[PDB]
Every structure is written in structure tokens, then in C-alpha cells.
Amino acid sequence: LKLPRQKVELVAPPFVHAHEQATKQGPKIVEFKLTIEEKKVVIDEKGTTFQAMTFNGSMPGPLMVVHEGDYVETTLVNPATNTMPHNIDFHSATGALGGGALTLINPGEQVVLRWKATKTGVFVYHCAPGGPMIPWHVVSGMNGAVMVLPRDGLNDGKGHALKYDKVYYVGEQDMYVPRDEKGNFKSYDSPGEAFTDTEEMMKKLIPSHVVFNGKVGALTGKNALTANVGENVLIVHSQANRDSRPHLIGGHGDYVWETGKFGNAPEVGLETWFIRGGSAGAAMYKFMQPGIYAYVTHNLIEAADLGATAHFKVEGKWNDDLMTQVKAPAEIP
Template sequence: MSRHSHTDRRAFLKTAGIGAAAVFAGCLGGGDTDAIAPPTNDAADADPAGESASLDPAAEVDADRIAADPTDVPDPVDWDEPRTHEVTMETQEVTAEIEPGVTFDYMTFDGRVPGPMVRVRRGDTVNFTLKNPEDSGLPHNMDFHAVYGPGGGADHTTIAPGEEASIRYKATYPGVHIYHCAVPNMDHHISAGMFGAILVEPKDGLPEVDRELYFGQHELYTNGETGQEGHHEWSVDAAKEEDPTYMAFNGEAYAFTKDGYGRVQVEQDERVRLFLSNGGPNLSSSWHAIGNVWDKLYRDGDLVSDPARYVETTPVAPGTVTAAEIRTPVPGPIKIVDHSLTRVARKGLLGVLEVQGEQDPDIYDPDGG
């Protein structure tokens, strides 16, 4: 599904009469509208005289979409003997929209944020190749947190434009781990989208679920204000202050809402496993599902210990992947957020699951009967 046009989005916000307080209530309370941001023009709020830093006009995009599809998850492990996997990724530097009218120069693995999930079994071998096209502007590499080896493989995969490099490693310890670019300016590369997840299933596998979803959280540090139209450049100063212009799931503000690519559809009475890769590069997430709890929580990607049960909100540090499961007994939206709620109401960090099904008044009666 394509994003709504910038004109449609602005019309929607104007028609809804959304101010900051109303948007905040809409994000948290939630009926039929996702009622999201930008709730106000932060640039104008911060600078009533209209003297905020000017930006170049929005750049021509070479990628219509940067946000990875959360449903694009590899199939569960169904083998019980060690295998060898051939995995190749290509670095792609692309210009795309953070939100309509706001462009940014992203850095990605395979053109999406987060990069593709790699899924193997403990004891498997991975032959990994990283390619950096000739038209790239920067060197890149790959640091797998699941790898024993110098830099998690980064030392031997650092490549200039037009080069490629290969490493071979055994997936020795189970868990779900982050991977990311780790060149000297790694904060820029990660913030701009170069991170993902590698899932190393225990030898006995993972419990069966009905559906799996994969999200990546990160911060975008730019020379503009949230909601300011034009082309946003990476800002070292904003990164040093750890003051992001946007925070996003999968690279784009509010991508998985009605005003983006649409809510992620799930069915009633499913068990859904979610993976959150927090690329950061700096800020921890207070990961929460509004209207639900983490029925099973695999803290810090630990898939071997018994999961925690019925956890409302959990910290996910930058450089960490956490897995959690929810149940879906009643229909309606489940809003996936960072419970540092200004990030939700003002900076773009919201995704919505839509549970399809019939009301069950024994569990929840929306009419209060």
C-alpha cells in the first residue's frame, strides 16, 4: 500500500482539528483513528517568528518506501542437523521520505529498515557476503552480535564502494541478536538505517506461534525540526546532544498506522511473536503494547531462559533485540509504542496492529453492558 499523499495527510490533520493534547489522547486511548503526528509544527512552536533554520527543498526520492514489511520474517527452523547458509546483503544508500514532504538520505542493508532478518539454528554455519556498490558514497561493514570474532565480523567486512567481502562463522550461541554497520561513524550509519537482527534458534527450536512480526526502532538526527518540510541532512550536533528530530519504527514516521501503509492485520485468538531490534544508536526503548501485555517476554534476546510472564513495559537497550508474545482475544487496535510518550505523540514512534474478529463481552465489553 502506498503512503497517503502529503496533501491528504495535511487535510486529514486539519479536518480532525488535532492539537497536541488531542493527538496525545488519540495515540493512547485509541478508537478508530490513530490520530497521529506531527500534532503541531514543532518548528513553528519553537520559533514563533518563523526564523527556524531553512532547509533545502525536499529531494527527489530514489526509493518510494524505506520501511521494511513487519510480516517479512523467515520461516521457523524445521531442521535438526547443522546446516550451512549462504547469506548475501548489499549496502544501499537511498533518498526517501521520513514522512510526506520530508526527505532524508538513508543507508540500508538491501534497501529496507531494518535490514532483513537472518534466521538459523544453533550450530549452523553462515557464509556471509557483504557487497558495497560502486555508486555508494561511503565505506560500510557488518558487525553481527551473534559472531565470535573481531568486531563481530566488522574487521574483515569493511569495504569501500565497488568492493565485497566474505566471512564464515558458526552460530555458536542461541538468541536473537542485532547486527549493524560499525565503521568509525557508526552512529550516523546506524541512525540512517544500517541495522537488523539475526535469530539463532536453540537446537530444540522455539515454541510455535500463529504469526511473527519484526520491527526496528531508531533515532533520526537531522538539521531540521520535526514536521519541517524539505530535505533533512544528518546532524552531528543533534546526535551529540542525543536529541533526535524523529524516532521511528522501520525508518518512517508512523509507517504502520491508517495514515501510513496501514495497520498490521492480525486475527483474533492468535499468539503473535514480535521482535524489536533497537538500533538506537543512543536511546533505550520502553517497549509497550497499549491494550495488551507481553504474555511471554524474552528479555534482551534470551531465548534459553524461561520467559517472563505478563510484563506491561520492558526496557530494550540500544544494540539489543528483544522478543515478546501477545495474545489477541478481542478485536480492535493494539498500539505498539515506546512508553517515553513524547516520542509517540511528537516524533513518529507508533505502529498499530489491527485484530480482526468478533466482540467477546466476557473479556471486554465496549458498551459497558
């Protein structure tokens, strides 16, 4: 394959490596490296720990961005410091179980897979070693997403360009942390040691935690997402194992691809959209009002109580036409 090669420096979520939307480039081989890391992490503000398994150290794995007709060449590395075999499956790719059947690597090995980006949209990628290990590796954190843009950029299905000013990637993770008899979350010395209890819980289908970017509160405070009034923000949302229903509290989805695929026109003016487990979707919104927004899954129990809330802090001028407090709280006459 005699095409130009381009390296990408991946960046940790929720940020997204620099890329063009519309491009004059033709097909290239776009080179990415993912290095697997198994590690024990803290997942909530109480100090609960979790045996995570990750691409590039993060949950989710980083967003990869290419254009239709590019070839995506990934070097997947499984250092000898890990304990388990791993692989990678791209929902964007055609053949060999998405790549999984060509990428199984033991600790100490690496592999190089190339796939042609023939389908546009946002797509999940995840580890899938085989059998019961498939769900376990995924719900341990081994999932991310790839975006395959049209070469002319995004459009509204009516002939008009949609151009985003910035993009964020929100990866949602269902986590299954068992409890002891008295009701405290358990801690484990290794992923292998966590497996039996964790699988028992998994099969009951109810997560203990549902988080964005790997942790309760990850996308809040210093790490809130940001925008200004007038900016059009693309929010890519993935969930590799379990459904979600994103909602921007105080905003909308102006243009939404909930099934995540750019060969389809977006829907307009949504309140809440739906990410099928095993997929990525995307929503664009032009901010109109300053202040704090919450970005949630709109099962509010999961949002407020299990971890699945992000914030935006938005700068700009308040628009009293759109909303105003006519009378502040006062005693009832």
C-alpha cells in the first residue's frame, strides 16, 4: 500500500487530538499506538478502588480521528508488566471480528493491524479476548472510540455544513464492584483476584458505578468541560456494554446522530438521546447562555447517585429573552 503516512499524537479524554473536519487530503495511512495498562485506580470520592484495564492508561481509551477512506494502522502493545492477553476490535472495521482475531497479544508482545475506514461515524473500539473474558475486559475499562469523518466534514442532511468549534469525548463506563457482607465495596490485589466476584455481579446486570472519564466527578471542577456562548460543541458519547441516555441540562442536542453514523442525517432539537450499548453517538450544540450545565445520562439515579454527571462551565452574556427570573423567590401573598 503506497500511500503517505501520518502519525497522530493521541491525547487523553475528554480532549481529542487535533484534526481537520473538511480536508483536501486524500487517503493516507494514519498511524496510532495504543499501549495497554492494567492498573488499580480510585473510582469515587469515597476512595473505592477498582481493577482497571485500559488502552493508553485512560478510561475511556483515547478518541482516534480519521477520514473516510483512510487506512488506520494501529500498533497495539501489551507490555510484560501486564498479566493477561489482550486484543483490539474496531466497530469501524470490516473483518476478523473487527480486528480482534488478528490482534491477540500476550504480555511482552505487540501487533500491527491496519483497517480501511469505509464507514463514517463514531464507533466503539474495545478488547475482546474470547468467551467470558470479552465482557470482563470491556467493563474493566478496555474500550474507547474512533471517529471517521467525511472528507467534506459534517452536514445537516439538507446541504449545509455543520462545523464544530470544539469536540469532547465522553466515555461512559458501567462498573461492577462487589460488596462485602457488611456492605462495603471490596478491594482486590489483581484483576485475576477480582474476577470471580466481579463476574458473579456482572451477570446480575446492575452496575455499582456509572462514570464518565473513569471516575465520579472526573469532568467537574478544574476538569469541567468548557465553552463560550456562540460556540458549537460536538459531544461524542460512547458506551461499549450498556445503554445510556445523554442529556445536556439547560441545553439541547441541536444536531444529533444517536446511532452515530454520518451517512444518516442528524435529528434536530432533541432533549435526550440514546446511546445503544456497544456504540458511539454524537450531538452538537451551540451554546446560547452562560453558566453551569450538567451533562448526564438521564437515568437520574445513575447520574446523581452512581457517578454519571459531567459539567460544562460556559462564559458569555446572559440572554434575558431566552430565560429570565421575572420575580425572585418571595413569600406567597
